[PDB]
């Protein structure tokens, strides 16, 4: 596992190229918020160099670069800020779980945002990478639309105590906002599970089972992405680096408690999904029971009747077919007899 | 010494003796001609095509001073890829692969590489391999292999094997895409068998590729002085390539698994459909056959004379009960 950190060579690729491992390439933008106790300034731009002199800023600053399909801007920012090339690859790489790394001059945290669309019942994941330096917080996103609006409002309108603190409190605020978004996503999953379970009992079709299976896969991915988040917060408040002050640790502990709660909720979800899954099978087996019950009712009533009809329909030229009351109608009576009793017998089992 | 495999059709020996000044290549079917080449200070590449000929591989084994245990390992075809470090020679077991998009089968041919001072020994099973680019590079002096020792030759052979693995991955990706398209819409009985075969192939590929990654990792991370330091980074790069393969296989497996999942979702619905069909068909014919038999006895007193033209009336009542049953099956979503 552990070894000298280095760039990873890839086949069919130039030795030094960094590739964006994602799908979103629509737009790119850089929003910078440089705030202090007295005054703040925010601006949205596209030219990278216009935000480069913010590296050596006494007041804390927050640089949100939305759109990392532009590998040039990411490479320029990482090269000027002194970020390691492997960290740049991790920023551009998206098919990886949330993680935390500690370096001499910065801490690097990979986290996953989440959105859920009830239509198409889709759960989309977007990776956000945070880099905390001595006096600046870089945040690489993928596409327009984040869950850090409350933090932006707090910076703009001087709510909370975020203005009176350094960049560590800003990092805590961003992580807490992401955890709150996770809680909202869990509420949406509550709603989806309730809506699916109120239907799986009385509408047991194949598309319902496909929905249940994709929901199970969604919760599996949720567990696989939230457990590393719990580990990240644990290492963040139990192995604090010099960059993070001694103060603000209890806030990270609070975020850790929140992710413990989230993990517990996901654990309950993992069993509720199976609870829904069993119900469809039970209902289909019940319908199968009903149809095969009427089938066996018909078979039981009619097979002996056909048998005895064949017995009295076979010719031997010596057959007692002439009896009291000419013999024949009694057979029909017997038919009805060996019919009605069967029905009565089935009334013992309450079939049909 | 027993050959566990099944390929024994042909056997031949190939020799590539290359240096900076010049190279000599010869294909010989006799064991003796290749013995003296251990003494040559130039890099040497021997290739034993057939191991079913236990005599030649045994003679090479006791002539090169390699323990009979690695001989048994070479003849053990059903062996995982692995690496063994010894004082005068390093032993490596790898698996090639061949995929044909007509039978959807994945056959593995084990290959053994023994690296001794300034020479490399290959042990294969069949005519034809994936080290042709290395042969062309040696012959036409395209690369820097001619200016290095046998360790770079081993690196080149392993790299060629990894490239063949990449080609196999491309073929499997095409198969996975086609099968996914055929399964998500328009399923049939052939598709599930194809999915099972693909899952078996992916399981085998994964089960082979992880030991290969372990082999490369242990090979570059800490190695005896058999391979020079100059070739240490190159092996490292190959390891990275293997990682790609491994990860891809994992991803592929997931996709295939998902497919099987959906096919296992609708089995009970299929049961319900089948006996809906069977119950409908048996419902409307068992009583009809019963009453046909009722009118089919041989009783003399049977009221069978005229009575509104005789037979047709019963047909009528048949249809009556029939349509009644049809009505009873028009509702309840059976039909």
């Amino acid at each position: 596992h552990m070894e000298e950190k280095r760039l990873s060579a890839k086949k069919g690729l130039p030795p030094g190229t960094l590739v964006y491992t994602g799908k979103y390439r629509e737009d790119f933008e850089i929003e910078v918020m440089n705030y202090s106790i007295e005054e703040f300034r925010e601006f949205k731009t596209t030219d990278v160099e216009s935000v480069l002199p913010f590296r050596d800023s006494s007041t804390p600053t927050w640089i949100n670069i939305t759109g990392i399909h532009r590998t040039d801007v990411v490479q320029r920012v990482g090269e000027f800020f002194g970020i390691h090339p492997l960290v740049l690859e991790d920023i551009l790489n998206v098919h990886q779980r949330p993680k935390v790394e500690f370096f001499e001059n910065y801490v690097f945290i990979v986290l996953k945002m989440f959105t859920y669309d009830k239509n198409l019942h889709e759960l989309e994941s977007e990776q956000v990478s945070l880099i905390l330096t001595k006096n600046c917080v870089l945040m690489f996103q993928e596409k327009i639309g984040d869950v850090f609006d409350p933090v932006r409002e707090r910076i703009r309108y001087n709510r909370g105590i975020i203005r009176k603190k350094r960049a560590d409190y800003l990092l805590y605020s961003l992580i807490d906002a992401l955890v709150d978004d996770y809680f909202v996503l869990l509420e949406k999953i509550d709603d989806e599970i309730d809506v699916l379970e109120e239907e799986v009992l009385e509408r047991p079709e194949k598309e319902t089972v496909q929905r249940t299976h994709q929901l199970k896969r969604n919760l599996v991915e949720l567990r696989k992405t939230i457990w590393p988040l719990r580990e990240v917060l644990s290492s963040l408040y139990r192995d604090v680096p010099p960059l993070i002050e001694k103060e603000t640790v209890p806030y990270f502990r609070d975020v850790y408690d929140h992710t413990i709660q989230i993990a517990d909720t996901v654990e309950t979800f993992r069993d509720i999904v199976s609870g829904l899954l069993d119900v469809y099978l039970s209902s289909v087996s019940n319908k199968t029971n009903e149809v095969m019950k009427v089938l066996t009712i018909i078979a039981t009533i009619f097979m002996p009747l056909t048998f005895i009809a064949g017995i009295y329909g076979m010719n031997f030229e010596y057959m007692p077919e002439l009896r009291w009351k000419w013999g024949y109608p009694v057979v029909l009576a017997v038919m009805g007899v060996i019919a009605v009793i069967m029905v009565v017998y089935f009334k013992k089992k309450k079939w049909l | 010494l027993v050959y566990t495999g099944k390929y024994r059709e042909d056997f031949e020996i190939e020799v590539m003796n290359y240096s900076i000044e010049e190279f000599r290549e010869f294909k010989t079917t006799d064991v003796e001609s290749v013995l003296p080449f251990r003494d040559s200070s130039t890099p040497t590449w021997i290739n034993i095509t057939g191991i079913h000929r236990t005599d030649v591989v045994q003679r090479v084994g006791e002539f090169f001073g390699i323990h009979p245990l690695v001989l048994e390992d070479i003849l053990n075809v059903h062996q995982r890829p692995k690496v063994e470090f010894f004082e005068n020679y390093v032993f490596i077991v790898l698996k090639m692969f061949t995929y044909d998009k007509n039978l959807h089968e994945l056959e593995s041919e084990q290959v053994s590489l023994i690296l001794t001072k300034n020479c490399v020994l290959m042990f294969q099973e069949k005519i034809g391999d994936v080290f042709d680019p290395v042969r062309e590079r040696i012959r036409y002096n395209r690369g820097i292999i001619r200016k290095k020792r046998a360790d770079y030759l081993l690196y080149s052979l392993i790299d060629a094997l990894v490239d063949d693995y990449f080609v196999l991955l491309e073929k499997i990706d095409d198969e996975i895409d086609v099968l996914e398209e055929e399964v998500l819409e328009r399923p049939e009985k052939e598709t599930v068998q194809r999915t099972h075969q693909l899952k078996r192939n992916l399981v085998e590929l994964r089960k082979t590729i992880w030991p290969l990654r372990e082999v490369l990792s242990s090979l570059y991370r800490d190695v005896p002085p058999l391979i020079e330091k100059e070739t240490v980074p190159y092996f490292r790069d190959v390891y990275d390539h293997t990682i790609q393969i491994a990860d891809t296989v994992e991803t592929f497996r997931d996709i295939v698994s998902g497919l099987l999942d959906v096919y296992l979702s609708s089995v009970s619905n299929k049961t319900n459909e089948v006996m809906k069909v069977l119950t409908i068909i048996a419902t409307i014919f068992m009583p009809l056959t019963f009453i046909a038999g009722i009118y089919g006895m041989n009783f003399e007193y049977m009221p069978e004379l005229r009575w509104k033209w005789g037979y047709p009336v019963v047909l009528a009542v048949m249809g009556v009960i029939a349509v009644i049953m049809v009505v009873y099956f028009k509702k309840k979503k059976w039909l």
Epitope: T71 | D173, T248
Partner: antibody, heavy 128, light 107 residues
Framework: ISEVQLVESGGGLVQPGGSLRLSCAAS????????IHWVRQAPGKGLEWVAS????????SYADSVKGRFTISADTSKNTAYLQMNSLRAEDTAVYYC???????????????????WGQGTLVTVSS | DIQMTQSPSSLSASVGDRVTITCRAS??????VAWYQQKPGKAPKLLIY???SLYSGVPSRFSGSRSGTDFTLTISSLQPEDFATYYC?????????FGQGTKVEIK
């Protein structure tokens, strides 16, 4: 600052067996962070990729039709790409385009490059 | 080399119709196929990459599909500004090759 723009120059009439250097000036981006391709299109025929350069490492790729003859290079100091064409045949008369490509990811083992922005293209005529 | 055989070559259709152009790779390419359009006398313009993804800025009417080694570009509804030559490109290997083109003309 400024939009992406690729400008070709250096094309012109040249005798068979001669040599000329096509220069592709890039404005709006750094050539070191992307790959630059040269694509050939004969008069009244389809496109034909002729060369590719990765300035961050100097790795080159050539088509089989021009292997050993064309030489592609790039300099970051001038932020420019160059295609030197010698031993030039009469079949090479065509319009040349200088395009910029970016890599995208499909699977962990497979990558692909797509040409975002193309240049105007310069016409090179080999005759007489 | 990898040969991309692209058919048809002289497709003709009217405005508002549905157009499908197919192209087949000689050997396996792992979905690394792009689709470009070129009007006469101008540089090609990228439309589709990864054989399914839609490039930024192009109209949504263009669509791309892949089945094994068969790549199809579909225009759901033609426009007066959609009559140009269309080219496949495979980028699986470092030697990247184009198709022969498919001209789309009014009928």
């Amino acid at each position: 600052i400024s939009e992406v723009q690729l400008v070709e120059s250096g094309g012109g009439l040249v005798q068979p067996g001669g040599s000329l250097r096509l220069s592709c000036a890039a404005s709006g981006f750094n050539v070191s962070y992307y790959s630059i391709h040269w694509v050939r299109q004969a008069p009244g025929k389809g496109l034909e990729w002729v060369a590719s350069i990765s300035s961050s490492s100097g790795s080159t790729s050539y088509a089989d039709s021009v292997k050993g003859r064309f030489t592609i290079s790039a300099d970051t100091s001038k932020n420019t790409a160059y295609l030197q064409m010698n031993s030039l045949r009469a079949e090479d008369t065509a319009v040349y385009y200088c395009a910029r490509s970016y890599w995208y990811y499909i699977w962990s083992y497979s990558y692909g490059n797509a040409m975002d922005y193309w240049g105007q293209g310069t016409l090179v005529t080999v005759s007489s | 080399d990898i040969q991309m055989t692209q058919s048809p070559s002289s497709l003709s259709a009217s405005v508002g119709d549905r157009v499908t152009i197919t192209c087949r790779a000689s050997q396996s390419v792992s979905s690394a196929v792009a689709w470009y359009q070129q009007k006469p006398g101008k540089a090609p313009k990228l439309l589709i990459y990864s054989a399914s993804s839609l490039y930024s800025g192009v109209p949504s009417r263009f669509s791309g599909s892949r089945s094994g080694t068969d790549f199809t570009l579909t225009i759901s509804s033609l426009q007066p500004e959609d009559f140009a030559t269309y080219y496949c490109q495979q980028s699986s290997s470092s030697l990247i090759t184009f198709g022969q083109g498919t001209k789309v003309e009014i009928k």
